[PDB]
Design an enzyme around this catalytic site. Structure first.
Site, PDB file in Angstrom:
ATOM      1  N   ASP A   9       0.867  -1.173   0.000  1.00 13.13           N
ATOM      2  CA  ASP A   9       0.000   0.000   0.000  1.00 13.13           C
ATOM      3  C   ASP A   9       0.904   1.223   0.000  1.00 13.13           C
ATOM      4  O   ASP A   9       1.557   1.514   1.007  1.00 13.13           O
ATOM      5  CB  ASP A   9      -0.936   0.001   1.209  1.00 13.13           C
ATOM      6  N   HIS A 831     -23.900  16.786  -6.281  1.00 13.61           N
ATOM      7  CA  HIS A 831     -22.938  16.462  -7.323  1.00 13.61           C
ATOM      8  C   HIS A 831     -23.649  16.427  -8.669  1.00 13.61           C
ATOM      9  O   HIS A 831     -24.778  15.936  -8.771  1.00 13.61           O
ATOM     10  CB  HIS A 831     -22.242  15.121  -7.057  1.00 13.61           C
TER      11      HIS A 831
END
EC number: 3.1.-.-
Length: 1337
Positions: A9, A831
């Site tokens: 990660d 949005h």
RNA sequence: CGAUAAAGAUGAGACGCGUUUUAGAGCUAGAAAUAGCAAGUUAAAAUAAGGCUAGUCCGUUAUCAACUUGAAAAAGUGGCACCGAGUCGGUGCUU
DNA sequence: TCTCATCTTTATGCG
DNA sequence: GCTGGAGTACAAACGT
DNA sequence: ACGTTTGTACTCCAGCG
């Protein structure tokens, strides 16, 4: 020899890693411990994370370097002026320059009299009384004609040279014209004298208020046009007005000449472009453009001068004298009115420097805005001030002369004042007459930006060659510096080298050889069929030359109809042919050939085979330089082949672009056998007519071996050099480099066995000043009045809803209604493209609304009715730089097609596949470092497989499956994310070996909208036992091959055991600091030893200096110091902080540095270099990290059990709620039934604090604040407990809040305890360790 | 395929401030303490200490656990398995 | 705060 | 905004 | 014994456009 896998990660300040086996288990190994401690072996787990500080860009260093260069060059300018003046200065006053040099000295250190200019008190007082400011002296020396002292002349000229203003306006500026209205009437008079059919009427127009207005330039033009009766901004008068304000107009459609002829007054090319325009139409328009130039000077000068120019030749000095006089008069009036009406607040206004009154305005640090903000309520609560309020609202009350508005002052005003002084005083001292051009050049010598630092081979940022070896002065810069070669190097040092031949520079995009290459390359693709031929055939080289000679030389853009007709019908007599391999229109064209044909007006010259290198040099010249005379001096060589008008049209011709294919590739490299270049194989290949992309990959041809030999040469680069070559921010580059080092160490740890799985994933990862600038520019561009309606603050913009109110025009979108500011709670953020399709939480996608249902549909882009109604507002906001072109396309997609099911399926797949280029680069680096060997037929054996995932997979696997992550507990979640990435990636490639081309970087071949929709909506459904209800079996199988890809009965406990696993190798990366020495603030004099001297001979107790230094690393020393009057050697052990200033002197000789510090008989072998973030272990697992030589950081990780983490996630309602009502109702019931988990978490925090986080008072305040708020709802208590985990966090201490109660950070001013502790040296994974017991020293 | 727009990275050439010390004789009443009054707008110099290669150059980016080999880039150094888990422990085998 | 240059990457429609 | 430096006020371990 | 330095609590600050 055990098979395993690695999960990664990668982030900007954190890299997580984990090693898993085939059964998704993290192994544990006994690692040997080196050092002098008793511990020899430690068991550690193969999971952990590396934490480091973020990488920084070089922009700050570049700005500092440019500032240093500017300071050096300004000092050199002053030195040149002193060198000019010195011969007569020694006759007038020989110590004058010496007195000016030692002005920053106290009386005890000055070698001369303390008075700089005249050297006696009476003359200094008389000078300061005659000229209170320098601008009085400048106005006097410009205007008066008597002989002045040489000191005063030097002071005025040096003030003009040191503060010479900007070079943004190129050409000449005449300050004699300053009335906007007078020259506007003159322009109208000239226009009416020229145009009689449609004269312009401009009587009764407030020209000064409109053209010199404070809003934007384009809006100023629009306001003038709107007032103008029956005129158009695209009209001739509108074009002249726009040219006057400086916005570039296009004179093509106004005059119908079919060239653009764009005119910008601030550019030096305007004179030659206007000469071209005079050649186009005639000289009868010259007075019109002269009037436009005069009116532009009137606009650009009335903003700064604001004074009469018919009574003086120094308008700026007169303006500053006017400012001084107004300041004096209003200061007297304000003092009188304050003493008369409010005599109590006279000491605060005029004597108290701490307040923001006049004393704080002048003596204190208060600015103009702060002084106005302080004094405006005082004037409001007073009834004798109207003109002062009028001036304050005009920002013209009590003005200084050295303000922030001087940035718009051109260098022409200072140059004109300097020239006036030189003209007045040249008859009295002949040396300024002989050196007039010298001083004017000193003022107006700006180094061209294409000539970098004037270096001599000892700089990394210089592209500059010298015609002769000589010291560069402002007067011989043109004769010494080869400017054309410098500009060629300027462009060529940042242009690319083509990938096939790394040592070869690319051609310009508009080259004749490049366009021949592309045209012949496309012509090889052409294939034809006509009657009588049994098979399709390709055009022979003689034919292709004939097709280029007719079609590409005539058409500019060939279509298949033209080539079919003219070549096949007209020449080859095939009346009917079918053409294949190209579209109806061709892509490739002889563009620069046609432009050169237009300019040169000759056709055989460009057709010629052996003149082509000349035209390549011509287009190289046109691509490299942008300054006119550079281009001129390069075509002086080739001018005699052309006409002078032709060479001028060449001069004004431009090409902006570079290709990515070099010259030796196109026509320099040739085959061993044939001897033909790649361009020649495009020209003639017998029958085959094969093309580029295979020609670099053809086994029979020797192009591929030369290209691979070129790539092998240089051996590529190192890992760090290959990393720095990549794109993206330097912080992510640091993350990738640490990732690669972690992978290498993990391969070394397992026994040099490589895993046949590597799963990586990457995070997606001041502003407020940009926010204020954007909103101000928007209201200036569109003429919005929202800031005048209600002005707001800067720190208030941090909230999203308030920003979104101010960004739009007080409305909400899709509906024509105003809305109000006070109703914060009842308004919500929407949005444009719905959250279900795509994830974009930026302002570029977000809209603040009052009612979201007026969008047409709830889950789609806004309806076509809304588009057809709001399109005018969207267009006017796009022109006002308040929405983006991407936002425009997203709003207007409804009329252009809306969302197709293909598009919806793409917005479903996009969350799963990682299309980001930087992740592909990391996967390529890891694949190259892991897979190294080749086999038969030279194929890379993919022993290591590198999978790339996006965070949606791991995030959904956490959310669906009760593996919740809370970031505020510890940094174990980084390693847990890496482990889960490994598990998900290996499970996905075990179950679906068909999605390898999507999820794995490699060379694979495995690959309508509705099936895609269900596939990429349901890819993770094999993990869950119930679908939607579908009962898939507990043990999953790969399908068409039998392996166990997932076992729901036992793997779940394995993942939960790995997540509930206490020992995770969290390593904070140990770094030696790089940066500036001290704080940049120069603080005044004080009797302290913590002040740093600004020069060698500036004692900080007498001159002030810098205070807070940055410690590079701490050094552990064991030595003996002097104690008492007898100076007895007392043994001591200590940490000394070596700062960045002291670091070079310390590393040059540590013993001399320590003996200078006071320590005696130090041991060179016992000196331990401890950088920042070094780890010490004291007792009971209490581990401390080193922040400096006086401060410690907390490094310990609280291994809180996973049940508490899950309860905290469910109770705090992370990311609100997104699930079925049954599921969230069950979760809320679970949270209700386990409210004693709050008390258990408080017990965990208190016990872990009492063991390692020694903060008694903070913990008592925490417990008291917890006992106060036990009646609050569980959600608020959970959120405040998540805030409470800041106490136990690993890192620097910081303050946190429990409800209303705040707890300040518990810090340390002592590092004495770690001197008798175990020092731990940790490898990058932390598995390999070295423990040093410092108590044995 | 070029194209359009935005963002980021890198490099150069320039401005305007800000800070610091000094200069711009503060007056009167008092033994001083202090009080009252006057004045305030500007300039010089420095703007990372500094360095040698002595340039109108460079000096705040990137790289950096320990030990050994090193001119450096860097290279080399540290058994395994099983049962467990509060920062890792225990047991067995082997070098 | 301004001017200029190079490169890459992402989002926007054609084919 | 972060977090290390610096100043202040003061009580407490600690060495002459 | 008395000084004294050190450990603790608390406050304020940070070059910008």
């Amino acid at each position: 020899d055990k098979k395993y896998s690695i999960g990664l990660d990668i982030g900007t300040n954190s890299v997580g890693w984990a090693v898993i086996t085939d059964e998704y288990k993290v192994p544990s190994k006994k690692f040997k411990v080196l050092g002098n401690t008793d511990r020899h072996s430690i068991k550690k787990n193969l999971i952990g994370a590396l934490l480091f500080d973020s990488g920084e860009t070089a922009e700050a260093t570049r700005l500092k370097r440019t500032a240093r260069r500017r300071y050096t060059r300004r000092k050199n300018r002053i030195c040149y002026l002193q060198e000019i003046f010195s011969n007569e200065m020694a006759k007038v006053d020989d110590s004058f320059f010496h007195r000016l040099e030692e002005s920053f000295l106290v009386e005890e250190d000055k070698k001369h009299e303390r008075h700089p200019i005249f050297g006696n008190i009476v003359d200094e007082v008389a000078y300061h009384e005659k000229y209170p400011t320098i601008y009085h002296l400048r106005k006097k020396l410009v205007d008066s004609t008597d002989k002045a002292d040489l000191r005063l002349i030097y002071l005025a000229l040096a003030h003009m040279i040191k503060f010479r203003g900007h070079f943004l306006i190129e050409g000449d500026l005449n300050p004699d014209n300053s009335d906007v209205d007078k020259l506007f009437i003159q322009l109208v008079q000239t226009y009416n004298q020229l145009f009689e059919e449609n004269p312009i009427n401009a009587s009764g127009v407030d020209a000064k208020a409109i053209l010199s207005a404070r809003l934007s330039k384009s809006r100023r033009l629009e306001n003038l046009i709107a007032q103008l009766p029956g005129e158009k901004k695209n009209g001739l008068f509108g074009n002249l007005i726009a040219l006057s304000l400086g916005l570039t107009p296009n004179f093509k459609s106004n005059f119908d000449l079919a060239e653009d002829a764009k005119l910008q007054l601030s550019k030096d090319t305007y004179d030659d472009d206007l000469d071209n325009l005079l050649a186009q139409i005639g000289d009868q328009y010259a007075d019109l453009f002269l009037a436009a130039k005069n009116l532009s000077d009137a606009i650009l000068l009335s903003d700064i001068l604001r004074v009469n120019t018919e009574i003086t030749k120094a308008p700026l000095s007169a303006s500053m004298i006017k400012r001084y006089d107004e300041h004096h008069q209003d200061l007297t009036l304000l003092k009188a009115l304050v003493r008369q009406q409010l005599p109590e607040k006279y000491k605060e206004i005029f004597f108290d420097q701490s307040k923001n009154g006049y004393a704080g305005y002048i003596d204190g640090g208060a600015s103009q805005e702060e002084f106005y903000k302080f004094i405006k309520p005082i004037l409001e609560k007073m009834d004798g001030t109207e003109e002062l309020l009028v001036k304050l609202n005009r920002e013209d009350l009590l003005r200084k002369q050295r303000t922030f508005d001087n940035g718009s002052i051109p260098h022409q005003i200072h140059l004109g004042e300097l020239h006036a002084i030189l003209r007045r005083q040249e008859d009295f001292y002949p040396f300024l007459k002989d050196n007039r051009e010298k001083i004017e050049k000193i003022l107006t010598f700006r180094i061209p930006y294409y000539v970098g630092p004037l270096a001599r081979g000892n700089s990394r940022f210089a592209w500059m060659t010298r015609k002769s070896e000589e010291t560069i002065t402002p007067w011989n810069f043109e004769e010494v510096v080869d400017k054309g070669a410098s500009a060629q190097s300027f462009i060529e040092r940042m242009t690319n080298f083509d990938k096939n031949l790394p040592n070869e520079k690319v051609l310009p995009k508009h080259s004749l050889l490049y366009e021949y290459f592309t045209v012949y390359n496309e012509l090889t693709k052409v294939k034809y069929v006509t009657e009588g031929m049994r098979k399709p055939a390709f055009l022979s080289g003689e034919q292709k030359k004939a097709i280029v000679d007719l079609l590409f030389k005539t058409n500019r853009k060939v279509t298949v109809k033209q080539l079919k007709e003219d070549y096949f019908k007209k020449i080859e007599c095939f009346d009917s042919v079918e053409i294949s391999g190209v579209e109806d229109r061709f892509n490739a064209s002889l563009g620069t050939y046609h432009d050169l044909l237009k300019i040169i007006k000759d056709k055989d010259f460009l057709d010629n085979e052996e003149n082509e290198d000349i035209l390549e040099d011509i287009v190289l010249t046109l691509t490299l330089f942008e300054d006119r005379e550079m281009i001129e001096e390069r075509l002086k060589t080739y001018a005699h082949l052309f006409d002078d008008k032709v060479m001028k049209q060449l001069k004004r011709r431009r090409y902006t672009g570079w290709g990515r294919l070099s010259r030796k590739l196109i026509n320099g490299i040739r085959d061993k056998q044939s001897g033909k270049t790649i361009l020649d194989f495009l020209k003639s290949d017998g029958f085959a007519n094969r093309n580029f992309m295979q020609l670099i990959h053809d086994d029979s041809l020797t192009f591929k071996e030369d290209i691979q030999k070129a790539q092998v040469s240089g051996q590529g680069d190192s890992l760090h050099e290959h990393i720095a070559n990549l794109a993206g921010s330097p912080a992510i580059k640091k993350g990738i480099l640490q990732t690669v080092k972690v992978v290498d160490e993990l391969v070394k740890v397992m026994g040099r066995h490589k895993p046949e799985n590597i799963v990586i994933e990457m995070a997606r990862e001041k502003n407020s000043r940009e926010r204020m600038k954007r909103i101000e520019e928007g209201i200036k561009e569109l003429g919005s009045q929202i800031l005048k309606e209600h002005p707001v603050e800067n720190t208030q913009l941090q909230n999203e809803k308030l920003y979104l109110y101010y960004l739009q025009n007080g409305r909400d979108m899709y509906v024509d209604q105003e809305l109000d500011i006070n109703r914060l709670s009842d308004y919500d953020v929407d949005h444009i493209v719905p959250q279900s399709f795509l994830k974009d939480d930026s302002i570029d996608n977000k809209v603040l609304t009052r009612s979201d249902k007026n969008r047409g549909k709830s889950d789609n882009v806004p309806s076509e009715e809304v588009v057809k109604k709001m399109k005018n507002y969207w267009r006017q906001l796009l022109n006002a730089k308040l929405i983006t072109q991407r936002k425009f396309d997203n709003l207007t997609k409804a009329e252009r097609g809306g969302l197709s099911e293909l598009d919806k399926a793409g917005f479903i797949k996009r969350q799963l596949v990682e299309t980001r280029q930087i992740t592909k680069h990391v996967a390529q680096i890891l694949d190259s470092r892991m897979n190294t060997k080749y086999d038969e037929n030279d194929k890379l054996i993919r022993e290591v497989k590198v999978i790339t995932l996006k965070s949606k997979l791991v995030s959904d696997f956490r959310k669906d499956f009760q593996f919740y992550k809370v970031r505020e507990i510890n940094n174990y979640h980084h390693a847990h994310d890496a482990y889960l990435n490994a598990v998900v990636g290996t499970a996905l490639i075990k179950k679906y070996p068909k999605l390898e081309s999507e999820f794995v970087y490699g060379d694979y071949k495995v690959y309508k909208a509705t099936a895609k929709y269900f596939f990429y909506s349901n890819i993770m459904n094999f993990f869950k036992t119930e679908i939607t209800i579908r009962k898939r079996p507990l043990i999953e199988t790969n399908g068409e091959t039998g392996e166990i890809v997932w076992d729901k009965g036992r793997d779940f406990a394995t993942v939960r055991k790995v997540l509930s696993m206490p020992q995770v190798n969290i390593v904070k990366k140990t770094e030696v600091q790089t940066g500036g020495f001290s704080k940049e603030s120069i603080l005044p004099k004080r009797n302290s030893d913590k002040l740093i001297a600004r020069k060698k001979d500036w004692d900080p107790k007498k001159y002030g200096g810098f205070d807070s230094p940055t410690v590079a690393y701490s050094v552990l020393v064991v030595a003996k110091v002097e104690k008492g009057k007898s100076k007895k050697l007392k043994s001591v052990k200590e940490l000394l902080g070596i700062t960045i200033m002291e670091r070079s002197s310390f590393e040059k000789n540590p013993i001399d540095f320590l003996e200078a510090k006071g320590y005696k008989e130090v041991k060179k072998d016992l000196i331990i270099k401890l950088p920042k973030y070094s780890l010490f272990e004291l007792e009971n697992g209490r581990k401390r990290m080193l922040a400096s030589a006086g401060e410690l950081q907390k490094g310990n990780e609280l291994a809180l059990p996973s049940k508490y983490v899950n309860f905290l996630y469910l109770a705090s309602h992370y990311e609100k709620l997104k699930g079925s009502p049954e599921d969230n109702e069950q979760k809320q019931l679970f949270v209700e039934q386990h409210k004693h988990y709050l008390d258990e978490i408080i017990e965990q925090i208190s016990e872990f604090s009492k063991r390692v986080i020694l903060a008694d008072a903070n913990l008592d305040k925490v417990l008291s604040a917890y006992n106060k708020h036990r009646d609050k709802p569980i959600r608020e208590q959970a959120e405040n407990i998540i805030h409470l985990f800041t106490l136990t966090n690993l890192g620097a201490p910081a303050a946190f809040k429990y409800f209303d109660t705040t707890i300040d950070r518990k810090r340390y001013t002592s590092t004495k305890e770690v001197l008798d502790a175990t020092l731990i040296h940790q490898s990058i994974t932390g598995l390999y360790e070295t423990r040093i017991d410092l108590s044995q020293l």
